[PDB]
Write a protein that holds these residues in place. Structure first.
Motif, PDB file in Angstrom:
ATOM      1  N   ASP A  51     -25.368  27.189 -13.988  1.00  0.00           N
ATOM      2  CA  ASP A  51     -24.448  26.084 -13.703  1.00  0.00           C
ATOM      3  C   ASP A  51     -25.061  25.259 -12.572  1.00  0.00           C
ATOM      4  N   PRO A  52     -25.906  24.274 -12.904  1.00  0.00           N
ATOM      5  CA  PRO A  52     -26.539  23.452 -11.854  1.00  0.00           C
ATOM      6  C   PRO A  52     -25.560  22.712 -10.973  1.00  0.00           C
ATOM      7  N   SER A  53     -24.347  22.444 -11.452  1.00  0.00           N
ATOM      8  CA  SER A  53     -23.339  21.801 -10.595  1.00  0.00           C
ATOM      9  C   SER A  53     -22.944  22.655  -9.395  1.00  0.00           C
ATOM     10  N   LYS A  54     -23.282  23.944  -9.386  1.00  0.00           N
ATOM     11  CA  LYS A  54     -23.008  24.720  -8.187  1.00  0.00           C
ATOM     12  C   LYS A  54     -23.787  24.246  -6.983  1.00  0.00           C
ATOM     13  N   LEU A  55     -24.823  23.437  -7.176  1.00  0.00           N
ATOM     14  CA  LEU A  55     -25.584  22.874  -6.075  1.00  0.00           C
ATOM     15  C   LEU A  55     -25.136  21.460  -5.722  1.00  0.00           C
ATOM     16  N   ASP A  56     -24.044  20.967  -6.321  1.00  0.00           N
ATOM     17  CA  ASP A  56     -23.522  19.649  -5.936  1.00  0.00           C
ATOM     18  C   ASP A  56     -23.111  19.626  -4.466  1.00  0.00           C
ATOM     19  N   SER A  57     -22.818  20.784  -3.901  1.00  0.00           N
ATOM     20  CA  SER A  57     -22.461  20.929  -2.496  1.00  0.00           C
ATOM     21  C   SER A  57     -23.700  21.096  -1.611  1.00  0.00           C
ATOM     22  N   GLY A  58     -24.897  20.956  -2.189  1.00  0.00           N
ATOM     23  CA  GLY A  58     -26.086  20.892  -1.362  1.00  0.00           C
ATOM     24  C   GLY A  58     -27.221  21.592  -2.078  1.00  0.00           C
ATOM     25  N   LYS A  59     -28.336  20.895  -2.282  1.00  0.00           N
ATOM     26  CA  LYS A  59     -29.430  21.485  -3.044  1.00  0.00           C
ATOM     27  C   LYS A  59     -30.335  22.339  -2.159  1.00  0.00           C
ATOM     28  N   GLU A  60     -30.400  22.053  -0.856  1.00  0.00           N
ATOM     29  CA  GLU A  60     -31.383  22.732  -0.012  1.00  0.00           C
ATOM     30  C   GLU A  60     -30.972  24.161   0.300  1.00  0.00           C
ATOM     31  N   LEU A  61     -31.918  25.085   0.176  1.00  0.00           N
ATOM     32  CA  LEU A  61     -31.685  26.507   0.396  1.00  0.00           C
ATOM     33  C   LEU A  61     -32.510  26.941   1.608  1.00  0.00           C
ATOM     34  N   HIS A  62     -31.847  27.156   2.752  1.00  0.00           N
ATOM     35  CA  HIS A  62     -32.623  27.342   3.981  1.00  0.00           C
ATOM     36  C   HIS A  62     -31.791  28.130   4.990  1.00  0.00           C
ATOM     37  N   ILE A  63     -32.467  28.532   6.067  1.00  0.00           N
ATOM     38  CA  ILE A  63     -31.881  29.266   7.184  1.00  0.00           C
ATOM     39  C   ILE A  63     -32.300  28.560   8.463  1.00  0.00           C
ATOM     40  N   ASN A  64     -31.344  28.216   9.332  1.00  0.00           N
ATOM     41  CA  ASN A  64     -31.658  27.639  10.626  1.00  0.00           C
ATOM     42  C   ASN A  64     -31.203  28.584  11.721  1.00  0.00           C
ATOM     43  N   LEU A  65     -31.974  28.683  12.796  1.00  0.00           N
ATOM     44  CA  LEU A  65     -31.615  29.491  13.954  1.00  0.00           C
ATOM     45  C   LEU A  65     -31.490  28.536  15.127  1.00  0.00           C
ATOM     46  N   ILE A  66     -30.326  28.481  15.756  1.00  0.00           N
ATOM     47  CA  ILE A  66     -30.055  27.441  16.735  1.00  0.00           C
ATOM     48  C   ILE A  66     -29.581  28.090  18.017  1.00  0.00           C
ATOM     49  N   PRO A  67     -30.386  28.160  19.064  1.00  0.00           N
ATOM     50  CA  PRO A  67     -29.944  28.697  20.338  1.00  0.00           C
ATOM     51  C   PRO A  67     -29.339  27.562  21.145  1.00  0.00           C
ATOM     52  N   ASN A  68     -28.332  27.897  21.956  1.00  0.00           N
ATOM     53  CA  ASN A  68     -27.758  26.915  22.868  1.00  0.00           C
ATOM     54  C   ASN A  68     -27.468  27.638  24.175  1.00  0.00           C
ATOM     55  N   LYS A  69     -28.267  27.348  25.207  1.00  0.00           N
ATOM     56  CA  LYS A  69     -28.133  28.061  26.470  1.00  0.00           C
ATOM     57  C   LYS A  69     -26.885  27.637  27.225  1.00  0.00           C
ATOM     58  N   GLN A  70     -26.419  26.398  27.021  1.00  0.00           N
ATOM     59  CA  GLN A  70     -25.228  25.931  27.730  1.00  0.00           C
ATOM     60  C   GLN A  70     -23.977  26.665  27.262  1.00  0.00           C
ATOM     61  N   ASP A  71     -23.863  26.899  25.961  1.00  0.00           N
ATOM     62  CA  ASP A  71     -22.738  27.615  25.389  1.00  0.00           C
ATOM     63  C   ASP A  71     -23.015  29.111  25.304  1.00  0.00           C
ATOM     64  N   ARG A  72     -24.242  29.519  25.594  1.00  0.00           N
ATOM     65  CA  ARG A  72     -24.685  30.914  25.453  1.00  0.00           C
ATOM     66  C   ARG A  72     -24.413  31.450  24.053  1.00  0.00           C
ATOM     67  N   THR A  73     -24.830  30.681  23.068  1.00  0.00           N
ATOM     68  CA  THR A  73     -24.663  31.079  21.680  1.00  0.00           C
ATOM     69  C   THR A  73     -25.982  31.038  20.930  1.00  0.00           C
ATOM     70  N   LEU A  74     -26.121  31.928  19.968  1.00  0.00           N
ATOM     71  CA  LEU A  74     -27.195  31.848  18.984  1.00  0.00           C
ATOM     72  C   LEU A  74     -26.531  31.742  17.632  1.00  0.00           C
ATOM     73  N   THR A  75     -26.828  30.671  16.897  1.00  0.00           N
ATOM     74  CA  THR A  75     -26.175  30.403  15.633  1.00  0.00           C
ATOM     75  C   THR A  75     -27.158  30.567  14.490  1.00  0.00           C
ATOM     76  N   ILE A  76     -26.795  31.331  13.476  1.00  0.00           N
ATOM     77  CA  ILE A  76     -27.604  31.557  12.279  1.00  0.00           C
ATOM     78  C   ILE A  76     -26.902  30.809  11.148  1.00  0.00           C
ATOM     79  N   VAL A  77     -27.511  29.748  10.610  1.00  0.00           N
ATOM     80  CA  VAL A  77     -26.911  28.921   9.582  1.00  0.00           C
ATOM     81  C   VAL A  77     -27.662  29.119   8.287  1.00  0.00           C
TER      82      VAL A  77
END
Ligand SMILES: CCc1nnc2cccc(Cl)n12
Length: 209
Positions: A51-77
């Motif tokens: 069902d290719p329409s399952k990617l209508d919500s976004g075609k890119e398949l990826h992982i981002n790692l986002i540190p933020n020292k001000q909020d003291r958070t590490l976010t895995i997206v």
């Protein structure tokens, strides 16, 4: 509107063990969360072949790692399949109950906490480093939700009104005061290279401003 739920006793017991046991090899939390993101990406990729329409919500398949020292958070997206409200309240914990029992038995027989992912409950390793975990998630078949827990036996779920994410999961780790090494670029790079070097999706480590 925020709903509050009690963890199953066995999951609360797992979380207490992770929080309380002396175990220095905390860095494996990142491998476990990246592995979970990879599995979620595999799932949407496979579903999209029929069902290719399952990617209508976004075609890119990826992982981002986002540190933020001000909020003291590490976010895995990740842009994986995401989780439904039923997953967050019931389904994941139902599956986790049996993996928890097997993991606890393995620990008593000599396994160590680094083996947690072999039992399917690697998400909870986030509590090796985080005092609170917030999960923002969007599955194609449901609304965007926020799950949150600081352990202690309860979690919350609410509809999320923040920036729409399209599809996937963001795991926000509110790091403990003594675990800020996991915001440092060189430390995260070292951990990804050691434990996650063959993951089949691009992992982008964002830089702090
Ligand atoms: C990333 C969210 C997640 N992944 N596995 C579990 C188990 C219980 C609760 C939550 Cl939010 N989980």
């Amino acid at each position: 509107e925020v709903e509050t739920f009690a963890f199953q006793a066995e999951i609360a017991q797992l979380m207490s063990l992770i929080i309380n046991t002396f175990y220095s090899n905390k860095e494996i939390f990142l491998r476990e969360l990246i592995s979970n993101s990879s599995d979620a990406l595999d799932k949407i990729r496979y579903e999209s072949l029929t069902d290719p329409s399952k990617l209508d919500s976004g075609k890119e398949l990826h992982i981002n790692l986002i540190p933020n020292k001000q909020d003291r958070t590490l976010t895995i997206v990740d842009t994986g399949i995401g989780m439904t409200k039923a997953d967050l309240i019931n389904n994941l914990g139902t599956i986790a109950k049996s993996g928890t029992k097997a993991f606890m038995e393995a620990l008593q027989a000599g396994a160590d906490i680094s083996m947690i992912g072999q039992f399917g409950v690697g998400f909870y390793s986030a509590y090796l480093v985080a005092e609170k975990v917030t999960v923002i998630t969007k599955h194609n078949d449901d609304e965007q939700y926020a799950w949150e827990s600081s352990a202690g036996g309860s979690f919350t779920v609410r509809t999320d009104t923040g920036e729409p994410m399209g599809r996937g999961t963001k795991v926000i780790l509110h790091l403990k005061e003594d675990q800020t090494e996991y915001l440092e670029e060189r430390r995260i790079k070292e951990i990804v290279k050691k434990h996650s070097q063959f993951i089949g999706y691009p992992i982008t480590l964002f830089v702090e401003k």
